[PDB]
Amino acid sequence: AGPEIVKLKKILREKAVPPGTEVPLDVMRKGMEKVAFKAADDIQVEQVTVAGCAAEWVRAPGCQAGKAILYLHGGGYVMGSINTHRSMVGEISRASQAAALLLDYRLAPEHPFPAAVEDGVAAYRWLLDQGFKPQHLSISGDSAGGGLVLAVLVSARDQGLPMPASAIPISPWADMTCTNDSFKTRAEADPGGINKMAARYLNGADAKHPYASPNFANLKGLPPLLIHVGRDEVLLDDSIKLDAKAKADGVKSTLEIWDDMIHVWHAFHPMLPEGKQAIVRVGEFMREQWAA
Template sequence: MSTPHLTDPLGIAYAEWSEEFVANPEMSLRMMRWVFEDWQRVTAEPEDVTYKSTEFGGVPGILVTPLAADPGQVLVFLHGGGFALGSSASHRKLAGHVASACGATGFVADFRRAPEHPYPAQLDDTTAVFDALVESGIDSADIAFVGDSAGANIAIATALRMRRRGTAGPGLVLTISPWLDMENSGETIETNNDTDFLITREGLQGNIDRYLSGGASPRDPLVNPLYADFSGFPPLYITAADVESLYADAARLHTLAAEAGVDVTFDVAAGQQHVFPLQAGRWPAADEAIATMAAWYRGRRNADAHRRTATSASA
């Protein structure tokens, strides 16, 4: 893939990474993890946000507290990185921008990563965080999962798993450039190859092999939500770029959720890179996407508050 003239911070970073990956085809996983910590470089530091290293349910991470945020509303952020890369550090600034726009607090979870900890360790950790928040007094309906790329997979799968176990799950699920297809069959992996400066089919397969090294099937709905029944799923927000290689995953998710009667919104960004909201504070399209996401969040939260008030009044 040739490197075009780029102006957006994320496209420049992805092109630089791709050059390093091509020049170092035997790059170790440890080195790849160091490279992906560079994600935070493209995000501006949000104003009036504090951070604290802490844990919920034994899972470490970073607590994100915007000024005047509602402590009773919590966004659980699940970072991307193919289940093997990325961290709370690489995503804390993005979480700060999103939480501030939503008027909520946030927790960026450092869930266990593959291949040292293959599926379902990631879902176990997200469930532990959720359960700990509920035990601390947060209403389950006031917890939202926010995930990008592989983190979006974890967010969706954890909500599906909670429904399967018959307990209350998150009130909302918000996804950015979701990666769901563990069969690596999405058509836009090929058709958008020249416009996506990070994703390759080979790279995806390497992360799939790490994630499923414990023997899980790539068709298990909790591994590949494109095989899931979304009936009864909470309100779902999806944003993705039309030129990214994983666009087909987002489009298929939207179709499945809509057919199941889910309250689902699909916001398509033109000409942007994978997880483009990471450029918050430095790229207009990223700021616009976060504002749209926050407006959706606030709208669903207000509707839920009215519903609870009406239910209480009629009781």
């Protein structure tokens, strides 16, 4: 075992709604805004707009000259925002000695798929039109953000974009049909409302569309991947298959299933030792890919 996730699973259990209570969308969004972590005080921010989206360049101490991270936040594609993900991304910047571009890409259901892919690609392109050098770039992202990381890669590659040096999807949702065992096998260990979000993002598009659900994509050509995911999460299967397909596709990845972990446990770094360490390790990984 270990005891910090025990306290914290108990905590998260008492705060989740029931099973299948039906939460409005602005009620869910404000929820997330109201309980989002304050970024550490040593982190600095600087707002920018990019491809018509608001953004923050998110810089911790340490940050090196050429380097950058296109960070994409999770939230189901229908929620989450610079603010909800500022704290964790600070930490990932601290661990990786790079500044992050923390994108407020378009959300459904006002902006359905392929909107948020069109934003990712456009931000990446922008980083390049700023003269960040592909091999100095990394791209990372939790949850829905994690699948998008992929989707932006396939997408940018299809359009002739030089690939970045690493990509680090965290607990990615890369399969919008949500049909994987882990939704059953793993359900009792996590805290379908995730299907309503597909429906919201998809808005009737092919749910196996490569750019929506990149576990059905051609990944041939993409850069070394490090994929994080907790044994006690519903989304486990999405991460193993991500690893399978990459393998299948020529790509390097290191799947690291962390046990007794839950969805994006990184986000609980302020009170969670594995939080802190998973983040450190995300850092080592892009630093490693960059040193190469």
